[PDB]
Amino acid sequence: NSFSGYLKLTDNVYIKNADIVEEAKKVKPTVVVNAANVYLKHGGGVAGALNKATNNAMQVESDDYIATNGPLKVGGSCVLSGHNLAKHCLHVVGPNVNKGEDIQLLKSAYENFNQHEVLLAPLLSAGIFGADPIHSLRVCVDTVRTNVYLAVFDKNLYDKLVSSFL
Ligand SMILES: O=C(O)C1=C(c2ccc3ncccc3c2)CCC1
């Protein structure tokens, strides 16, 4: 958890313009959050990038978790190995509002972060899930009570989030 170069937005939310894969490889945090789907199929976005950085070890483990436990619920999570990226990966399912899933479940999704004192994470439901990323940061700030270090890849999005916040 030796994070560096973050800007503190609130007592417990920090942000950096960084690639979450590179941050995980540098810091090897106790927990890295994945922006997952209910079947843990890590096909694109942050999920595809974290799985690729494990050379598909994350996907093989996830398929076994699903065969034994069934799919997650939207707003839910599971804890699996972080492989080379972290001690643990917290796979969290935010709603895909582009498919009619309820935006209220974004609060439920962020509540899962409270089971861990420190996390490295992306914004949930941003990208292909369709939620406005600045709304997702507001829900994170209003819901997460533990220490969360948010990595945002895109510089234009990062500058917009920092300006809206501070
Ligand atoms: O943080 C961003 O800029 C966002 C996304 C993203 C998408 C793909 C990524 N592939 C590798 C590492 C980080 C990634 C991050 C999806 C929406 C917002």
Side-chain angles (χ1 to χ4, degrees):
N1 301 324
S2 78
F3 297 99
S4 62
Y6 284 77
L7 169 71
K8 192 173 189 165
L9 295 181
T10 70
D11 285 340
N12 67 292
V13 179
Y14 298 86
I15 196 171
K16 183 176 184 179
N17 181 200
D19 176 340
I20 190 170
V21 168
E22 300 297 317
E23 287 293 298
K25 294 183 187 168
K26 282 170 197 179
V27 173
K28 198 158 176 43
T30 303
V31 180
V32 66
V33 171
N34 180 32
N37 55 42
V38 295
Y39 282 93
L40 303 185
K41 291 298 200 187
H42 309 303
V46 165
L50 288 178
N51 178 56
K52 175 179 189 167
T54 76
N55 302 102
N56 214 50
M58 175 183 287
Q59 188 66 74
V60 175
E61 178 192 29
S62 293
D63 289 346
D64 174 67
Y65 170 88
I66 291 292
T68 301
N69 298 279
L72 291 180
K73 284 165 168 140
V74 173
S77 72
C78 67
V79 177
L80 290 173
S81 181
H83 304 273
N84 50 305
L85 303 177
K87 189 186 184 172
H88 307 291
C89 178
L90 180 67
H91 297 268
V92 179
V93 186
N96 181 332
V97 305
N98 282 354
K99 292 184 161 163
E101 299 180 350
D102 209 305
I103 194 61
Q104 264 163 120
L105 295 164
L106 186 53
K107 180 171 208 60
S108 307
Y110 278 117
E111 288 177 331
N112 294 286
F113 284 27
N114 293 331
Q115 199 60 30
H116 299 282
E117 290 298 310
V118 178
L119 316 91
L120 166 64
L123 283 173
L124 301 174
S125 290
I128 89 142
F129 292 69
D132 185 7
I134 313 170
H135 175 71
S136 181
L137 175 60
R138 293 270 178 228
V139 180
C140 184
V141 158
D142 288 344
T143 311
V144 179
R145 294 182 319 263
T146 55
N147 307 293
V148 60
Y149 287 86
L150 296 166
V152 178
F153 189 101
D154 190 89
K155 168 120 205 287
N156 295 302
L157 172 59
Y158 171 88
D159 287 343
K160 187 134 80 222
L161 291 164
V162 166
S163 76
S164 273
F165 214 89
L166 307 175

